[PDB]
Design an enzyme around this catalytic site. Structure first.
Site, PDB file in Angstrom:
ATOM      1  N   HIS A   1       0.805  -1.223   0.000  1.00 30.16           N
ATOM      2  CA  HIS A   1       0.000   0.000   0.000  1.00 30.16           C
ATOM      3  C   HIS A   1       0.835   1.268   0.000  1.00 30.16           C
ATOM      4  O   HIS A   1       0.405   2.320  -0.497  1.00 30.16           O
ATOM      5  CB  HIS A   1      -0.967  -0.009   1.200  1.00 30.16           C
TER       6      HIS A   1
ATOM      7  N   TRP B   1      -8.174 -16.729   2.344  1.00 30.26           N
ATOM      8  CA  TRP B   1      -8.159 -17.187   0.966  1.00 30.26           C
ATOM      9  C   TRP B   1      -7.734 -18.653   0.889  1.00 30.26           C
ATOM     10  O   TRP B   1      -7.965 -19.336  -0.113  1.00 30.26           O
ATOM     11  CB  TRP B   1      -7.218 -16.346   0.109  1.00 30.26           C
TER      12      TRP B   1
HETATM   13  C1  HEM Z   1      -7.126  -5.283  -6.978  1.00 33.64           C
HETATM   14  C2  HEM Z   1      -6.172  -5.437  -5.927  1.00 33.64           C
HETATM   15  C3  HEM Z   1      -6.414  -5.822  -4.600  1.00 33.64           C
HETATM   16  C4  HEM Z   1      -7.511  -5.547  -3.787  1.00 33.64           C
HETATM   17  C5  HEM Z   1      -8.882  -5.016  -4.172  1.00 33.64           C
HETATM   18  C6  HEM Z   1      -7.056  -5.752  -2.475  1.00 33.64           C
HETATM   19  C7  HEM Z   1      -7.901  -5.827  -1.345  1.00 33.64           C
HETATM   20  C8  HEM Z   1      -7.630  -6.445  -0.108  1.00 33.64           C
HETATM   21  C9  HEM Z   1      -8.526  -6.521   0.945  1.00 33.64           C
HETATM   22  C10 HEM Z   1      -9.879  -5.827   1.061  1.00 33.64           C
HETATM   23  C11 HEM Z   1      -7.778  -7.038   2.014  1.00 33.64           C
HETATM   24  C12 HEM Z   1      -8.241  -7.286   3.459  1.00 33.64           C
HETATM   25  C13 HEM Z   1      -8.010  -6.113   4.378  1.00 33.64           C
HETATM   26  C14 HEM Z   1      -8.505  -6.419   5.810  1.00 33.64           C
HETATM   27  O1  HEM Z   1      -9.699  -6.590   6.028  1.00 33.64           O
HETATM   28  O2  HEM Z   1      -7.737  -6.348   6.768  1.00 33.64           O
HETATM   29  C15 HEM Z   1      -6.579  -7.478   1.494  1.00 33.64           C
HETATM   30  C16 HEM Z   1      -5.485  -7.970   2.265  1.00 33.64           C
HETATM   31  C17 HEM Z   1      -4.241  -8.435   1.802  1.00 33.64           C
HETATM   32  N1  HEM Z   1      -3.725  -8.068   0.618  1.00 33.64           N
HETATM   33 FE1  HEM Z   1      -4.793  -7.223  -0.947  1.00 33.64          FE
HETATM   34  N2  HEM Z   1      -5.807  -6.236  -2.480  1.00 33.64           N
HETATM   35  C18 HEM Z   1      -5.353  -6.123  -3.728  1.00 33.64           C
HETATM   36  C19 HEM Z   1      -4.066  -6.512  -4.140  1.00 33.64           C
HETATM   37  C20 HEM Z   1      -2.950  -6.907  -3.353  1.00 33.64           C
HETATM   38  C21 HEM Z   1      -1.630  -6.999  -3.790  1.00 33.64           C
HETATM   39  C22 HEM Z   1      -1.009  -6.483  -5.107  1.00 33.64           C
HETATM   40  C23 HEM Z   1      -0.908  -7.405  -2.658  1.00 33.64           C
HETATM   41  C24 HEM Z   1       0.482  -7.493  -2.438  1.00 33.64           C
HETATM   42  C25 HEM Z   1       1.475  -7.981  -3.371  1.00 33.64           C
HETATM   43  C26 HEM Z   1      -1.849  -7.623  -1.654  1.00 33.64           C
HETATM   44  C27 HEM Z   1      -1.556  -8.133  -0.378  1.00 33.64           C
HETATM   45  C28 HEM Z   1      -2.485  -8.575   0.572  1.00 33.64           C
HETATM   46  C29 HEM Z   1      -2.160  -9.241   1.746  1.00 33.64           C
HETATM   47  C30 HEM Z   1      -0.851  -9.914   2.123  1.00 33.64           C
HETATM   48  C31 HEM Z   1      -3.284  -9.114   2.565  1.00 33.64           C
HETATM   49  C32 HEM Z   1      -3.451  -9.757   3.953  1.00 33.64           C
HETATM   50  C33 HEM Z   1      -2.964  -8.864   5.102  1.00 33.64           C
HETATM   51  C34 HEM Z   1      -3.475  -9.250   6.503  1.00 33.64           C
HETATM   52  O3  HEM Z   1      -3.840 -10.396   6.696  1.00 33.64           O
HETATM   53  O4  HEM Z   1      -3.782  -8.345   7.263  1.00 33.64           O
HETATM   54  N3  HEM Z   1      -3.075  -7.243  -2.054  1.00 33.64           N
HETATM   55  N4  HEM Z   1      -6.446  -6.986   0.248  1.00 33.64           N
END
Ligand code: HEM
Length: 291
Positions: free
Chosen positions: A49, A188
Site C-alpha cells: 500500500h 483465501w
Molecule cells: C485489486 C487489488 C487488490 C484488492 C482489491 C485488495 C484488497 C484487499 C482486501 C480488502 C484485504 C483485506 C483487508 C482487511 O480486512 O484487513 C486485502 C489484504 C491483503 N492483501 Fe490485498 N488487495 C489487492 C491486491 C494486493 C496486492 C497487489 C498485494 C500485495 C502484493 C496484496 C496483499 C495482501 C495481503 C498480504 C493481505 C493480507 C494482510 C493481513 O492479513 O492483514 N493485495 N487486500
C-alpha cells in the site's frame, strides 16, 4: 518530478542485512498476532500500500517519500488495519534510526516474504523521506467490488501488465480479510503464513458460491471455508487472466520468479537509480545464517 535514490550515508549491504535480521527475529517472536497468523502478511500488505499510491503520469505518490508516516495517509480508509505493521516496525526503526522510512517499510515486505519461505526478492536502498505536503490524497488504492476491466485499468497506473497483475495478486495466499477493516471477512486458503501458489489452486479447484457477508458486501465463499474478493474472482472470469492463473497453479517456481520480479518493480516504481548505485541486494534468511 524526479526521485533519485540516495544511499544512507556510509551504509552497505551488511548494514541492511542487520535490519532484515531484526525484522525477522521479531517476526519469529510475535507469533500470536491475528490468531496465530503472525505479522508476515500485514507487513507485505503495508509494503504494497505504501508503493501502491504511485501515479506513473506525474510521479506523485510511491514508496520513495515515506509519506505513510503522516496522518492523512495512515488515516486512509484503504489502509485500515495497517497501523499494526507500522507499530511492529517502530522498535526496529528505533534500533536503526539511520534507515529511511520508505526503505524500512519496503524492506519489511521483502523480509516477510522470504521468511515465510517465498522466493528471494532483490531489494535496493536509497529512498529518502519527503515532507508532509508530498503526502498523496486518499483514494489511490483499489476497490474490491469491481471486475477485471477495472483491475486491468487500475494496475496500468502502476505500469503493470497482465502477467504482473496476476503474479502480484498471488500474495492473497497470505493472511485474511477482516470485517471491521475492509467490510470483507475470511481467509483465501489454509496455509496463510507460508508463501505458496495456493491462491491459484484455490481459485481453480474450489466450489465457489457468491454470497453477501455481514457487512452486506458480495464475496465468493467455498465449502472449505475460504473466500475470494470480486476482484480476485475476476482473474478467472477474464480469459487472459485465466490462462496465467492456470500457469501459476501448475508451476510454483514460475509463479515465484514472476512474483519476485513484479514485487521488486512495484516497490521501486518512481525511483531513479543512478548508473553507479549499488547492485540490488539479496538478503540471507535467518535459516541461511544459522540464526
Ligand atoms: C485489486 C487489488 C487488490 C484488492 C482489491 C485488495 C484488497 C484487499 C482486501 C480488502 C484485504 C483485506 C483487508 C482487511 O480486512 O484487513 C486485502 C489484504 C491483503 N492483501 Fe490485498 N488487495 C489487492 C491486491 C494486493 C496486492 C497487489 C498485494 C500485495 C502484493 C496484496 C496483499 C495482501 C495481503 C498480504 C493481505 C493480507 C494482510 C493481513 O492479513 O492483514 N493485495 N487486500
Amino acid at each position: 518530478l524526479v526521485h533519485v535514490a540516495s544511499v544512507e550515508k556510509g551504509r552497505s549491504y551488511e548494514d541492511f542485512q542487520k535490519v532484515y535480521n531484526a525484522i525477522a527475529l521479531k517476526l519469529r517472536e510475535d507469533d500470536e498476532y491475528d490468531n496465530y497468523i503472525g505479522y508476515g502478511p500485514v507487513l507485505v500488505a503495508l509494503a504494497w500500500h505504501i508503493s501502491g499510491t504511485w501515479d506513473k503520469h506525474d510521479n506523485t505518490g510511491g514508496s520513495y517519500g515515506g509519506t505513510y508516516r503522516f496522518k492523512k495517509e495512515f488515516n486512509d480508509p484503504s489502509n485500515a488495519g495497517l497501523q499494526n505493521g507500522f507499530k511492529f516496525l517502530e522498535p526496529i526503526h528505533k534500533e536503526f534510526p539511520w534507515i529511511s522510512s520508505g526503505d524500512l517499510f519496503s524492506l519489511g515486505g521483502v523480509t516477510a516474504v522470504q521468511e515465510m519461505q517465498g522466493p528471494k526478492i532483490p531489494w535496493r536502498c536509497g529512498r529518502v523521506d519527503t515532507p508532509e505536503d508530498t503526502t498523496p490524497d486518499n483514494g489511490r488504492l483499489p476497490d474490491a467490488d469491481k471486475d477485471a476491466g477495472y483491475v486491468r485499468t487500475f494496475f496500468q497506473r502502476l505500469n503493470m501488465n497482465d502477467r504482473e497483475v496476476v503474479a502480484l495478486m498471488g500474495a492473497h495466499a497470505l493472511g485474511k480479510t477482516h470485517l471491521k477493516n475492509s467490510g470483507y471477512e475470511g481467509p483465501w486458503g489454509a496455509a496463510n503464513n507460508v508463501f505458496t501458489n495456493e491462491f491459484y489452486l484455490n481459485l481453480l479447484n474450489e466450489d465457489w458460491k457468491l454470497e453477501k457477508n455481514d457487512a452486506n458486501n458480495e464475496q465468493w465463499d467455498s465449502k472449505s471455508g475460504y473466500m475470494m474478493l470480486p476482484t480476485d474472482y475476476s482473474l478467472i472470469q477474464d480469459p487472459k487472466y485465466l490462462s496465467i492463473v492456470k500457469e501459476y497453479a501448475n508451476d510454483q517456481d514460475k509463479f515465484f520468479k514472476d512474483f519476485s520480479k513484479a514485487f521488486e518493480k512495484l516497490l521501486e516504481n518512481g525511483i531513479t537509480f543512478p548508473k553507479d548505485a549499488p547492485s540490488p541486494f539479496i538478503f540471507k534468511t535467518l535459516e541461511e545464517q544459522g540464526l
